[PDB]
Amino acid sequence: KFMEFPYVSPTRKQLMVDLMSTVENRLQSQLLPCNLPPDVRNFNNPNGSAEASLHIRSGDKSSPIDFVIGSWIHCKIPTGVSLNITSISGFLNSSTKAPNFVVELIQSSSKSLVLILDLPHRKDLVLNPDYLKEYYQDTALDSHRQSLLKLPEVNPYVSPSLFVRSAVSPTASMLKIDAEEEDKLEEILRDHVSPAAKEVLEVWLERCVKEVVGEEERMELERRDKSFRRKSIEDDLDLQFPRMFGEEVSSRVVHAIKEAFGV
């Protein structure tokens, strides 16, 4: 209940469905059932300006997964133009050093789209070049970024947030797709974005999830993981959610998210 993705195109919808199904299927034996209140799994603004749905599976202890979060947001800006955000993120706990996973599509017009697809690092890459070799050089991650760039309507996306720029790995696909034809953008999605996203997901599941972390290393992991979670919720939710949904709906959803993220 979330898998409806009602406000987006079928191609995008199918991609989000493929990805969420793959995650839930491959990690079933390590994923708890969703425990969010129903008034947090699906919520909206009293005035009808915004609608969202949230799906969070916590991971078992003795397992490497902290949680998995899937979401969609639909928000009709007073102008009449609707903002549609869809995302799947995978967070690993401090029992492993391996990278997280994120896919996010952010679309305002029929022809323009921001893609964020990455396996965010959980160790300092400069202190730990061995980590960099292990999870990014040895894998084929950079090729997805590169292959997507070839396309004439795909250009680099440079976040206005310096924090988001620093939190993604050096292989991250941060892309702005500007296909001035709805037909072309959807063609980009199924032929290009979709195989990229599915392939990035596969290396996360086999190379990061599947497989001891030292006392001070785990403490470092938790500290950095917590810093990431705390800062991003402050930037992304603590002003945009009260605005999109009202202060009633936000406070309870934000609290539920904070609790889930352990912040």
253 is in an annotated binding site: no
Rounded Cα distance, 120 and 138, in Å: 16
**Pair 175, 192: CB distance under 8 Å:** no
SS3 content of the chain, % helix, strand, coil (to 5): 45, 25, 30
174 lies in the site for Na ion, by CB under 5 A: no
Find the part of the chain contacting Na ion (CB under 5 A) among 46-54, 134-142, 149-157, 163-171.
149-157
The one of Na ion, a second copy, none whose footprint includes residue 154, by CB under 5 to 8 A per kind, is: Na ion
What's the angle, vertex CA 147, arms to CA 194 and CA 18, rounded to 5?
A: 10
**Selection from 19, 21, 17 nearest residue 196 by Cα:** 19
159 is in an annotated binding site: yes
**Pair 160, 133: CB distance under 8 Å:** no
190 lies in the site for a second copy, by CB under 8 A: no
136 lies in the site for a second copy, by CB under 8 A: yes
165 lies in the site for a second copy, by CB under 8 A: yes
Largest Cα–Cα separation, the chain: 54
154 lies in the site for Na ion, by CB under 5 A: yes
127 lies in the site for a second copy, by CB under 8 A: yes
228 lies in the site for a second copy, by CB under 8 A: yes
Rounded Cα distance, 100 and 95, in Å: 13
Size of the site for a second copy (CB under 8 A): 26
Q: What minimum distance in Å lies between the beta carbon of 155 and Na ion? A: 5
Q: How far is residue 93 from each of residues 68, 173, 177, 183, 262, measured CA to CA in Å? A: 11, 24, 33, 41, 11
Find the part of the chain contacting a second copy (CB under 8 A) among 12-20, 60-68, 125-133, 195-203.
125-133
Q: Which residues bind a second copy (CB under 8 A)?
A: 124-129, 132, 136-137, 142, 146, 156, 158, 162-163, 165-167, 169-171, 223-224, 227-228, 231
Return binding residues for red chlorophyll catabolite.
Answer: 104, 157-159, 236
Q: Which residues bind Na ion (CB under 5 A)?
A: 154
